């Protein structure tokens, strides 16, 4: 797994994850590999 969540921070879709946990599950929802 490489730096992929860099874009996640921009899109509120998975960015909201960092609000209560901020791990990867949210990003995996629309990608898969972390």
16 is in an annotated binding site: no
- For tokens 């599950």, what's the residue? 25
2 is in an annotated binding site: yes
9 is in an annotated binding site: yes
CB 29 within 8 A of CB 16: no
Distance CA 33, CA 25 (A): 9
Total tally of structural domains belonging to the chain: 1
27 CB contacts (<8 Å, ≥6 apart)? Answer: 4, 5, 8, 14, 17, 34
Question: Domain residues for 22?
Answer: 1-34
């Amino acid at each position: 797994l490489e730096p992929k969540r860099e874009v996640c921070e921009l899109n509120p879709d998975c960015d909201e994850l960092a609000d209560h946990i901020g791990f990867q599950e949210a990003y995996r929802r629309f990608y898969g590999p972390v």
